[PDB]
């Protein structure tokens, strides 16, 4: 169970870093709909889990996703 | 009579301006809430129709050098005085109301007409009901009418304007009782009349009853009675009696906005009248009739069309013969859905040939179309603002393309060329590379049906379907020198094609295409008894029109 929870973590994170590198920006909940539609026939959208995990890569260079300055995301690598 | 002004009238006005700014030969001063305005009586008499009587009538003002004029703004009177002294107005977009207020205050006819034109040209989206109440307060039939129609058109789509609540009865009666309501249903005006009587009742119960009657039996057969039992003041008996009267009399008749038939607008048709170059006509899918439209410029051709989600028609660019004893003009126009005319708008900055206008997020995007040709960056795009009424430069195209097509899918800009496609993201103002087609075809157009782009034709019958969520190009089938025109009819993908052979006549027929079947089923064959030949450079677009306002195109079967 914990192994496949980690598997779902991997899935969502990879999906985000690979797709959003050429997609839009989420003022609040815009790109989460897309990342859930991409993983619709994979598993459960798990809103709480993905919301808790997208705000961890914020302080990790790639996908800065500045929480307070949620108006323009860094389109860099 | 000889009234030469070469270096004489301008010199006289410059001398008057010099005497004014230096405060010379002044004999009258205006006191405006403590502010002093020394000026002359001659200029005030020749400019304003009130100051002439202020300085002619032998009352108190005649000898009064220090006249205390009130109920006038300082900046407005200052700009009026400087316009009288130099002829230039230089009006902004904010102080137009108080300017007209004080222009009508002094009956200054020239600046009155100027501000009237500026207001009649600037009824864009929001100040409509506000300037309508303005023209109602200051009786201005010219402004009144344009504003009336503007409200009949847009008000019947928002019916929640904060300014719309504060309206005088007679104006509301004229608005509601008119047969120009652009509403596809009869309950919206009912609930709109209702909310106009949910903010003010009791003391305004008379107005409540009046508007209720106005709604007519069509919308009187609703919850109107129960809502009134809920909000009526107590101890009211005759009011229920007069409300019960409104149910059977007063000529229940159908409205006009319900006649929003989804039709097929065509341009540059074979003028039924010989040497006439081109004409703009329409086709009815359900009524099976062919209506006509008036040419926007009546001489200029090679225009591009676009239809906003609010069913609006626009025309940009084009070329007109020089009529010396085809020049390109960047003019802009808009089609009236009721008056069957074309009101111009803010022209473009570059004279384009066949511009491709695309609507997205409430903005009009004109992609390519021979902007000037000699650009340093030959690939550029100019967008339009439907709210601010201005043109805004955006990120230019990546590559220079000719005979291209552009559509809008999922609130995004998509332009298609020979083999390449670029998604302009309006939010980030950037161009992201998209998939490339394996076939190189030009002189074709694309349609934005649902979430899939259908690039049809090219040189043929190439059916290359593209999806945004999948980002791939695929083939479906071949349609059974055809001129293809893919378009959306009744939330269903269809096509309008014409075949032409040698020593044969042209035939018009539209087919119904299915997504999973990959086949164009025979939907309807346009009979030649109602529609005649169109030509080669004709365009097609989907839009709702009114049959009563337009006129049928007379042509022998």
Curated annotation (Swiss-Prot), chain A:
Residues 7-69 form the Cullin neddylation domain. It is found in: Nucleus; Golgi apparatus; Cell projection, Cilium, Flagellum; Cytoplasm, Cytoskeleton, Spindle. Neddylated. Attachment of NEDD8 is required for the E3 ubiquitin-protein ligase activity of the BCR complex. Deneddylated via its interaction with the COP9 signalosome (CSN) complex. Brain, spermatozoa, and testis (at protein level). Widely expressed. There is a cross-link at residue 21 (Glycyl lysine isopeptide (Lys-Gly) (interchain with G-Cter in NEDD8)). It comes from the Eukaryota. Belongs to the cullin family. Forms neddylation-dependent homodimers. Component of multiple BCR (BTB-CUL3-RBX1) E3 ubiquitin-protein ligase complexes formed of CUL3, RBX1 and a variable BTB domain-containing protein acting as both, adapter to cullin and substrate recognition subunit. The BCR complex may be active as a heterodimeric complex, in which NEDD8, covalently attached to one CUL3 molecule, binds to the C-terminus of a second CUL3 molecule. Interacts with RBX1, RNF7, CYCE and TIP120A/CAND1. Part of the BCR(SPOP) containing SPOP, and of BCR containing homodimeric SPOPL or the heterodimer formed by SPOP and SPOPL. Core component of multiple cullin-RING-based BCR (BTB-CUL3-RBX1) E3 ubiquitin-protein ligase complexes which mediate the ubiquitination and subsequent proteasomal degradation of target proteins. BCR complexes and ARIH1 collaborate in tandem to mediate ubiquitination of target proteins. As a scaffold protein may contribute to catalysis through positioning of the substrate and the ubiquitin-conjugating enzyme. This is Cullin-3. It comes from Homo sapiens. The chain holds residues 692 to 768 of 768 of the full protein.
From Swiss-Prot, chain B:
GO terms for cellular component: Cul3-RING ubiquitin ligase complex; cytoplasm. Keywords: Kelch repeat, Phosphoprotein, Repeat, Ubl conjugation pathway. One of its GO terms (biological process) is phosphatidylinositol 3-kinase/protein kinase B signal transduction. It comes from the Eukaryota. InterPro entries: BACK (IPR011705), BTB-kelch_protein (IPR017096), BTB/POZ_dom (IPR000210), BTB_POZ_KBTBD2 (IPR030586), KBTBD2_BACK (IPR047074), Kelch-typ_b-propeller (IPR015915), Kelch_1 (IPR006652), SKP1/BTB/POZ_sf (IPR011333). The modification Phosphoserine is found at residue 295. GO terms for molecular function: ubiquitin-like ligase-substrate adaptor activity. Residues 128-224 form the BACK domain. Kelch repeats lie at residues 312-362, 363-411, 413-451, 452-488, 494-540. SMART domains: BACK, BTB, Kelch. SUPFAM superfamilies: Kelch motif, POZ domain. Component of the BCR(KBTBD2) E3 ubiquitin ligase complex, at least composed of CUL3, KBTBD2 and RBX1. Interacts (via the BTB domain) with CUL3. Recognizes the BCR (BTB-CUL3-RBX1) E3 ubiquitin ligase complex substrate, PIK3R1, through the 4 tandem C-terminal Kelch domains. This is Kelch repeat and BTB domain-containing protein 2. It comes from Homo sapiens. The lineage of its organism: Eukaryota, Metazoa, Chordata, Craniata, Vertebrata.
């Amino acid at each position: 169970r914990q192994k496949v929870d980690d598997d779902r973590k991997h899935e969502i994170e990879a999906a985000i870093v690979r797709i959003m590198k050429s997609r839009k920006k989420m003022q609040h909940n815009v790109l989460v709909a897309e990342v859930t539609q991409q993983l619709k026939a994979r598993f459960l959208p798990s809103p709480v889990v993905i919301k808790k995990r997208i705000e961890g890569l914020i302080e990790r260079e790639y996908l800065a996703r500045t929480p307070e300055d949620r108006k323009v995301y860094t389109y860099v690598a | 009579e000889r009234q030469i002004n070469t270096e004489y009238a301008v010199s006289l006005l410059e001398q008057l301006k010099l005497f004014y700014e230096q405060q010379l030969f002044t004999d009258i001063v205006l006191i405006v809430e403590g502010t002093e305005f020394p000026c002359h009586k001659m200029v005030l008499a020749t400019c304003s129709s009130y100051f002439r009587a202020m300085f002619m009538s032998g009352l108190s003002e005649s000898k009064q050098t220090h006249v205390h004029l009130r109920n006038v703004d300082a900046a407005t009177l200052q700009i009026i005085i400087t316009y009288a002294y130099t002829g230039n107005l230089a009006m902004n977009d904010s102080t137009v109301e108080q300017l007209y207020e004080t222009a009508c205050f002094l009956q200054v006819e020239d600046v009155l007409q100027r501000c009237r034109e500026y207001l009649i040209k600037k009824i864009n989206a929001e100040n409509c009901v506000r300037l309508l109440s303005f023209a109602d307060l200051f009786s201005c039939e010219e402004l009144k009418q344009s504003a009336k129609r503007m409200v009949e058109h847009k008000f019947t789509a928002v019916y929640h304007q904060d300014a719309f609540m504060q309206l005088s009865h007679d104006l509301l009666i004229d608005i509601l009782s008119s047969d120009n309501l652009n509403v596809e249903k009869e309950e919206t005006v009912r609930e709109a009349a209702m909310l106009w009587l949910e903010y003010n009742t009791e003391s305004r119960s008379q107005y409540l009853s009046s508007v209720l009657s106005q709604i007519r039996i069509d919308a009187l057969s609703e919850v109107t009675q129960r809502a009134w039992f809920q909000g009526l003041p107590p101890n009211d008996k005759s009011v229920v009696v007069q409300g019960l009267y409104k149910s059977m009399p007063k000529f229940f008749k159908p409205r006009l906005g319900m006649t929003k038939e989804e039709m097929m607008i065509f341009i540059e048709a074979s003028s039924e009248n010989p040497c006439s170059l081109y004409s703009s006509v329409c086709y009815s899918p359900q009524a099976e009739k062919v209506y006509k439209l008036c040419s926007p410029p009546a001489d200029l051709h090679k225009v591009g069309t676009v239809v906003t989600p609010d069913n609006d028609i626009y025309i940009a660019g084009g070329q007109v013969p020089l009529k010396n004893t085809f020049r390109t003009v960047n003019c802009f126009y808009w089609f009236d859905a009721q008056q069957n005319t074309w009101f111009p708008k803010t022209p473009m900055l570059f004279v384009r040939i066949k511009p491709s206008l695309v609507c997205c997020e409430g903005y009009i995007y004109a992609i390519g179309g021979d902007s000037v040709g000699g650009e340093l960056n030959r690939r550029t795009v100019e967008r339009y603002d439907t709210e601010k009424d201005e043109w805004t430069m955006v990120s230019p195209l990546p590559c220079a393309w000719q005979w291209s097509a552009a559509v809008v899918v999922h609130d995004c800009i998509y332009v298609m060329t020979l083999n390449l496609m670029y998604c302009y993201f309006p939010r980030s103002d950037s161009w992201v590379e998209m998939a490339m087609r394996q076939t190189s075809r030009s002189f074709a157009s694309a349609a934005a049906f649902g979430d899939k782009i259908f690039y049809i034709g090219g040189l043929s019958v190439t059916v290359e379907i593209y999806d945004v969520n999948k980002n791939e190009w695929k083939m479906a089938a071949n349609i059974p020198d055809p001129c293809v025109r893919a378009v959306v009819i009744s939330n269903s993908l269809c096509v309008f094609m014409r075949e032409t052979h040698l020593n044969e006549r042209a035939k018009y027929v539209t087919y119904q295409y299915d997504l999973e079947l990959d086949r164009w089923s025979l939907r309807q064959h346009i009979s030649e008894r109602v529609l005649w030949d169109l030509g080669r450079d004709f365009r097609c677009t989907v839009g709702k029109l009114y049959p009563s306002c337009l006129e049928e195109s007379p042509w022998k079967p």
